[PDB]
Symmetry: C4
Subunit: 439 residues, 4 copies
């Protein structure tokens, strides 16, 4: 009836009729609004972030006694004078920060160093006897920021050492031009671990940074926040056009008795996103990155909306029409064969993985498999050579060609395949009783 025309209607044919074109322009407003919300937001998150990393990487630059000819820090002390060396350099770094550090960041009214010790240790190499107590007692030591350093350390008993402290910084180019909180204290922990007891104590400096606003600001009702609330009003108006889409879906359920479900799921993530960016505006958390992930999932789904827009012009939408069509054999293939993947990762995992990486995480082995699926890594995998067991390397070539095998021969092809097939029927059926009664 007329209901079937309002429902099976064409946006562009709806342009022929009057007083319909208002909804689309509303929706494009939502498009570029959300788009800007991205834009401006991305300045926001990245500027914040990069300042943190900047300041971050540098804190290593002040407090690590040295850096090498290789940029990579993965390397750490062999020496006793090395550790007491890093301690002198860094405690005196606490001291000499006011003078030497070229950054503004200064002490706020303070440091500390933790050392973790073994409850009852015993080592007897002579009789081979080895006695351990699985209890660690942590002694914490406190630094006052302004000279002599007293160090008590026993080498065999050392599992982990750390130091903690938190230094203040207020970001000038951040609060100067735009609105984001200018203070974040970077709470630093530098660490040296014998955790494995091997003779190399693996040193890394790691900083967590917390966002706080200046107690006062005097420089030289925020329209950008009220704009995010007005784009948020665009998003609630979009969840209201998603509520008119939802009553449209309720009317399509009554008549049935979704492109919008995407559109509404979007501006719901955008709505929860706008509320939540209001929320990290209130909280000042600095781990609100999530609020970012939340916010951007929206950007995504809204741009599949960019998909049904261009699809809206041409109207035969074959690219997303065939893709949609055979997604069944697609997902069935992914989750079914992805098992085969898993198993190989395991095989690589118990035999190969000892050999692969110094981090030697199965996660990494999974990743570098899929790396060869991407065509690279053969070069760094083939390169590092077993040579201990001719059987070891022998299997090594056996599987790596086996799997690198089963996908090129097998993986792309099934893909390429069902892809081909439903392209065919797409073009074919382009060239139902429900539509018949609709006619």
């Amino acid at each position: 009836r007329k209901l079937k025309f309002f429902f099976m209607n064409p946006c562009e044919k709806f342009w022929a009729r009057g007083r319909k074109p208002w909804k689309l322009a509303i929706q494009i407003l939502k498009i570029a609004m959300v788009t800007i919300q991205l834009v401006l937001f991305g300045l926001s998150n990245q500027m914040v972030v990069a300042f943190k990393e900047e300041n971050t990487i540098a804190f290593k630059h002040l407090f690590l006694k040295g850096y090498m000819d290789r940029m990579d820090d993965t390397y750490a002390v062999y020496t006793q004078s090395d550790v007491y060396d890093q301690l002198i350099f860094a405690v005196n770094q606490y001291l000499q920060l006011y003078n030497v550090s070229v950054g503004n960041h200064a002490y706020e009214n303070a440091m500390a160093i933790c050392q973790h010790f073994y409850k009852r240790g015993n080592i007897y190499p002579g009789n081979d006897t080895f006695d351990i107590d699985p209890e660690i007692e942590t002694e914490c030591f406190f630094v006052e920021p302004d000279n002599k350093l007293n160090l008590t350390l026993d080498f065999h008993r050392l599992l982990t050492v750390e130091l903690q402290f938190k230094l203040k910084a207020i970001n000038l180019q951040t609060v100067r031009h735009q609105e984001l909180p200018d203070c974040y204290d970077f709470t630093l922990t530098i660490t040296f671990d014998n955790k494995a007891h091997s003779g190399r104590i693996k040193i890394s400096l790691d900083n967590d940074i917390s966002i706080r606003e200046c107690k006062d600001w005097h420089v030289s009702t925020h329209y950008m926040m009220i704009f995010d609330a007005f784009v948020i009003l665009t998003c609630l108006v979009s969840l209201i056009l998603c509520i008119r889409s939802v009553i449209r879906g309720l009317q399509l359920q009554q008549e049935f008795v979704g492109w919008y479900i995407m559109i509404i799921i979007s501006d719901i993530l955008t709505i929860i996103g706008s509320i939540l960016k209001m929320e990290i505006q209130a909280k000042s958390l600095t781990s609100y990155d999530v609020c970012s992930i939340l916010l951007g999932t929206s950007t995504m789904l809204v741009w599949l909306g960019v998909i049904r827009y261009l699809g809206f012009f041409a109207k035969y939408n074959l690219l997303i029409l065939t893709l949609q069509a055979a997604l069944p054999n697609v997902i069935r293939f992914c989750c079914c064969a992805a098992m085969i993947y898993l198993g190989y990762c395991f095989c690589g995992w118990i035999v190969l993985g000892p050999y692969h990486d110094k981090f030697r995480s199965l996660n990494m082995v999974s990743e570098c498999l899929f790396s060869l699926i991407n065509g690279d890594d053969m070069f760094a995998t083939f390169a590092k050579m077993q040579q201990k067991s001719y059987l070891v390397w022998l299997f090594s070539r056996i599987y790596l060609y086996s799997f690198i095998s089963l996908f090129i021969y097998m993986i792309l092809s099934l893909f390429i395949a069902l892809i081909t097939d439903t392209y065919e029927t797409i073009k074919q059926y382009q060239q139902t009783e429900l539509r018949t009664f609709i006619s």
Copy 2:
């Protein structure tokens, strides 16, 4: 009629008839002429260029106080004695250039250093108060090239420092053998920026170089320039064979009431190219690289002419026949799905991009997406580890496999697909009323 034979005529069948073969040989002359114009020109642009870069990279070699074990310069001072160190080294570099610099380049009748300052600064860490004035006053200082150095710098207030100066060089192996202007003054600016205020002041030396001809030259009517004017006469004769092609197209419009449109668009870019290389011959600009881009677009289109030449021999031109044929689904797919691309770049852009690069430009994120589209970068993207939020890295794997997913499963396949299909109908229809009335 006879008009249809002159029009639907075969170049090689035209060889059977007499006094026709002159136009093609004219056109091959244009082929290898333009080809040479490339050749000789490429010597020209590259020799110039490489000299600039040579001299360039080296200027960093003189005036940067140091270089590291890592080739990469991205790194910069942590220290106050470091900056005054780079200043001493470089001002004394100005001084000691005559003696120490192994290059010819010398002062011409002179340097300077700029420092940009804050209008009204205030920093109060104790009460958390932070006061800034968004106005920068630049003080410029002048160097006379032949000893004492006085430095006035305040650390908190420092946003950017620079130095400028322009040194003279006349390129020997350039003007010696061939004709290109031998003098280019490289106007240098070395810089140290606290622009972010982080504690690392990011140092880079950057040179713009300007081309000028020696006022006099005595060594030991230019035929190479008149050759470029004669190949330019070949190009105007080609725009005249493109005007005979255009009156040929006017006759084909009258009869219709283009391979040439390419041929003429080419030798028009080649003609504007020959005029413009005459033009940077007059101007001596050194940013005439554009004149190069202009010039070479020609090389391009003329070699798609190389395409209809070999196609001219075989005459069934299926490779460019099928490609042409289905370019519709091709461009429709590119610009339609390329949306999907865009959206992902955004998603990566707000959540992932904080994490990806120290430059952290969305441009770069776009680039390294398409990098995985090329099969590499999985290795450097998978490698650098979030580890702050299990949700952060969690999404990280979610999308990177999601998109790396949608294209391998989706991207090549649609491609491979329409490509297959129109190959089929190409071979098929190989194996119209207009042609019928032509018969």
Copy 3:
């Protein structure tokens, strides 16, 4: 008959009938049991291993007199004072280990250095005469671990030098938390070879490590070993469900007069695997890595069982149905064309391989061919430039494009092809007299 129903029966349709569902749950128990056996085992092998490598890499860190700006150790002495330098550093390393080495590892009641000499040497450069005796006499020297060093070396006559020694270490974080032997003596051999007589004596330190259990342990009937025996009882129960599968196959041979053959081959490798992990539990070998390879082949085949499980749900198993189907043209193509591969490796091998690598192993040349098959290495292969013979580099480009050619044009395509075809008949025959008599 009824026999044909028990045989051509559906697991999920068997769920409709009663007292059948017990066998599957038995088999899933075997799934996640074996899965855990992996899990726990993988902790085991990797923790052991990584400790060895840790301690390992570091031993180089103590005893190599130096490390460079490049991480790579491939480089070695040019000097006489260099070798006597490495000797001083390392013999004094033996000495100063107790004091300087930050690892626990200590001497156990001792080192030695071997030098291999020429039987009768003669070198006469003046008259060009060159006399050699193909007999090497090895003199071994012994180190007592607690000062003066006397060195006797002749440069021309030096083929290989080594030193051997074995140091004791008991791994704390290994025996502390879980059960694995805590002592492994790393028997070290550091070496300097003039083996080629070139003027660079290629230095590497290499360690073999042997596992031994502490003679006594006092800390602060193993259920994990009895769990591996109980999962081993799961595996024997699985070889007994593989014996019921085998009597099932004997009944299917009688009726015929295998998915299980995989299932049983698996839990046989898992059974020999469980017995053998019991066996390296008895032996304490440290080259039991094989026992790992043995053990994991199981993980593999059992997860192709994960394949017939998900396949068990959907029941039309097309992904493994088409793959199975045309594996004939697959294996025929692999082993047939893989000849063509071989030949190219040879061609590259005699002409190209001189040029390719400093290790210059044909194995490596084979590997980096298949590397370009993976899309990478063009960059490091194209980069290193012949330039001695224009014919040398000329062929160099000839073949590398020739083969890189024959596979892209040829290799993926045949692949993609038969893959396509049997996908078609898979979908077709989805859309026998034996089955007819079964009906």
Copy 4:
């Protein structure tokens, strides 16, 4: 007739008949003979070679005054004291070689240094006047190997400096175990060039090495050379079975009024190869690498013979049957589109190539295009940033996506395509009047 049966006969069906099986076993003998000739030969060429490179790389190790934190030597002096520094180090290297050099290689009854000078130079920066004389006079200086060094150099006038000398080495592990000439004098030339006059004088050491046999040898009718003559007799017997194949082809021309043409072209390259390895056995050239290329082309074609062997077993040879079949559209596509390639390289060549590489060779630009065709290099191409002209980088992204575009969208697809099609008719016609009259 019977002639058609001897001709259209099956090797394996010929096994049914008697006294035929002798020819094949002859031919397999040729297979593994030639195979061994490879084998042994490959030892030969590689061992020689690697010794040369060994000794080679090291000569740089003695005579370059320094090496850096970066392995790459591409870098060279900025300084006057640097060049006189390299001279001292290297002339004194000539001196101190007997003592310091850990290699055997010694002087044979001597060095020299060349400096190339400008005929009439004039530099006038003040008035901008620049005068040059395009004539270089080379002064050569001679070194006697056993102390004071006198240096005469003018900086502006310096185009190129070199030094030459040739040092003797007799390769121990080469002549000791097997037969190859043990002496090769490595004639060295180290060089420093201001060739561009830029202020960095690009230093490289380059060695040509010549093979000579020891005048006498006393150690502790060659069967390996007579084996290469006997495998060469296998090759002449193979050119005689290729002459029986050629009279077989003459009989097939008479009956017609080639697999063998390959077989004979092979053992002709193998025959000329065996004669020529006899020939570099006589000549002792050391640039006989060609003799290697000659020799191995054989290995190649003989292993396409490995192709018709396995094809000989199965007998339906579809993999090489379809490949053969549509090679027409294949080669037509390669040489036709490869034009399109060329043109792009040019476009990249005049505009992009200034920017790409410091070597900035169009050859390299061609190579790295085809690199992206291989899926890598996007990372190093996208990375290095124009930033001088927004138009420069703008086109930069324009084309790199344009071409990276036209092949993925276009290149593999046509490929994948004709490959698919003739696979189809291969399988089809598997599932002529000449054969009919043969029947």
